[PDB]
């Protein structure tokens, strides 16, 4: 390895792990996986603009940035992100798939109160995604932005999807189903310095061929955006994963990634100041300038709905 | 070192590498703490029925099964608890704390709607801790055990305590807020073994001093008594900490404990059958059998309301 300590390896020697010494096991999907379960969390630097988008494979990055935006936007329709040229979650929100897991009476691309409606508005009532939920329900992440913010060394500073209660109404329950910001102080030498933010996420089932470099990815990009609204400087993310496993069709194509030797991560660069962006709300995907990625080829793998 | 892989010196170097590296800050209690994010996590093996009691100072084993039980049944009356003389949480359940937190329209020692209302009645209407919760909210425990014994693979087996909405009404937000299960199947060259159930809990917020020995012999146990209602065989415990401390005031109390050399951790065994217990709602205090318990003497630390 040219540079062993780049932390891609992190990444690539799980997916080793997980095939060699992996767990054969049925799945809800079908297709079959190969698990370990609590391996050891990834850790990523965020230092100095840097972004973990992998460069072992093309990551969709415009799909990684919609999807989030789409989050804190709160809005539960998939239409709102195939209408931009995103079709991850079009395989859940099929009308097909829907009336599978018994939510035959929603239109296709209504998944019902995840990710977003809980981060936004986490106890509100749900109807359908056209539903009024403005002030309704636990703003989750406007509360981490104020306590980051007026109350920096608080100890619950929260972003959680997981609700026993909506789990039902939902096409698929929350995979990153929560994560912790932690603010350090700026050191006694310089307190003229920004604080450093930091991110852990866990994560209760990762499809790393698929999913993974899109988790890592999103909450890196979290993580930023908090920061530019925070005036706090991006420091680190942790990846905490619960059942890490790879599916049984990924194997030979992870295999051909697993050859390749990582590029430097690329880093990000806002388009716009805070100023104009204002609030968490305000961010739109050309804000999110990307310079220097450079990775190797696509690698195609089946998503099992 | 005698056993360098005596598993308590992860606890123990821990403790010692926050007092030496940590960071100094304010928080929430005002007695001050020295911190570190996101430290790697704890692993404990359950195997030959071991229960990692910490020995390097004398753990109130009575007062963790007490809670643990407390949990269970769902109760959040603390007058439960120190009605059978275990005292851990009156010093948040106490008039003066609950009226400092704006609860003063509750009796002392009505914690609220914390961990086992949320575990057993997640989503109910919470009136004061003698409503009838009976059949109300999401009862996550015993669907924990139920996905266990018929749907081992599946990855949502989670037990959580956070809830948004419900706390403000909380004294305290839950410390270890959620936990995930892991059931790995029986290998080919013996089908008749019982399948292995590990457990994951992720901890916002960490009192090395006095709560993490808690917490660990805690969701050992649970995973011990869901073991045996589940017909499977406890296999690994996994600590993953968010805020990570030692409070100012338990530094000097803690290098005595960091020089003392563990004890092999004590064994679990059960004064009742799987039948005569019946279900996860019908363990007694008198049913752990804890045997080979070996501790140095006991430590004082005073804990910060
Ligand atoms: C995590 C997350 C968000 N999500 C949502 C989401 C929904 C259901 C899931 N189901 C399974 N089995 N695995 C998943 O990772 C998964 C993830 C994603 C969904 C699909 C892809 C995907 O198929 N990407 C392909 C094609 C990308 C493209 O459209 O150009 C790829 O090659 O990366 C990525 C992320
Ligand atoms: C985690 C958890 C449960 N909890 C609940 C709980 C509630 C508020 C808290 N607040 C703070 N600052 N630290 C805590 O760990 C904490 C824990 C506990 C509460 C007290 C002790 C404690 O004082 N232990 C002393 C005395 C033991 C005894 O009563 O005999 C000790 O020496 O261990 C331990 C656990
Ligand atoms: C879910 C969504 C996400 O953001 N990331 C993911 O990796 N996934 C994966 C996990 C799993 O392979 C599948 C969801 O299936 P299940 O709910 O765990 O059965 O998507
Ligand atoms: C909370 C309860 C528990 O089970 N274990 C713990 O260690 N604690 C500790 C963490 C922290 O010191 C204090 C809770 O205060 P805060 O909500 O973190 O501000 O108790």
Redesign the interface.
């Known amino acids: 390895r040219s540079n062993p300590d780049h932390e891609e390896y992190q990444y690539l020697d799980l997916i080793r792990r997980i095939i060699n010494v992996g767990?054969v096991?049925?799945?809800?999907t079908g297709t079959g996986t190969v698990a370990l379960?609590?391996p050891?969390?990834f850790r990523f630097s965020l230092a100095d603009n840097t972004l973990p988008l992998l460069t072992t494979k093309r990551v969709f990055l415009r799909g990684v940035i919609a999807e989030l935006l789409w989050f804190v936007s709160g809005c539960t329709d998939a239409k709102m992100l195939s209408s931009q040229g995103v079709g991850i979650w079009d395989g859940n929100g099929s009308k097909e798939f829907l009336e599978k897991v018994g939510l035959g009476h929603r239109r296709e691309g209504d998944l019902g109160p995840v990710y977003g409606f809980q981060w936004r508005h986490?106890?509100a009532e749900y109807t359908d995604a056209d539903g009024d939920y403005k002030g309704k329900?636990?703003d989750?992440l406007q509360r981490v932005i104020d306590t980051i913010k007026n109350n920096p060394?608080?100890?619950?500073i929260?972003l959680?999807a997981?609700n026993?209660?909506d789990?039902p109404l939902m096409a698929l329950?929350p995979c990153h189903?929560?994560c912790?910001f932690?603010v350090?102080?700026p050191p006694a030498d310089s307190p003229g310095s920004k604080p450093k933010l930091?991110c852990?996420m866990?994560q209760?089932?990762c499809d790393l061929g698929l999913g993974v470099p899109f988790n890592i990815a999103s909450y890196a990009l979290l993580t930023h955006m908090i920061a530019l609204i925070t005036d706090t400087e991006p420091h680190?993310f942790?990846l905490?994963m619960?059942?890490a496993h790879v599916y049984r069709d990924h194997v030979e194509p992870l295999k051909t990634q697993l050859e390749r030797e990582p590029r430097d991560f690329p880093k990000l660069k806002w388009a716009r100041s805070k100023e104009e962006i204002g609030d968490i709300d305000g961010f739109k995907v050309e804000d999110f300038v990307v310079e220097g990625y450079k990775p190797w080829g696509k690698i195609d793998m089946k998503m099992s709905a």
Chains 1, 2 share one sequence.
Request: proline share 10%.
């Open positions: 767990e096991r049925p799945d809800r379960f609590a050891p969390s986490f106890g329900g636990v989750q060394t608080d100890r619950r929260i959680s997981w026993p209660k789990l329950p189903m929560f912790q932690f350090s102080l930091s852990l866990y209760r089932s680190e942790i905490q619960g059942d």
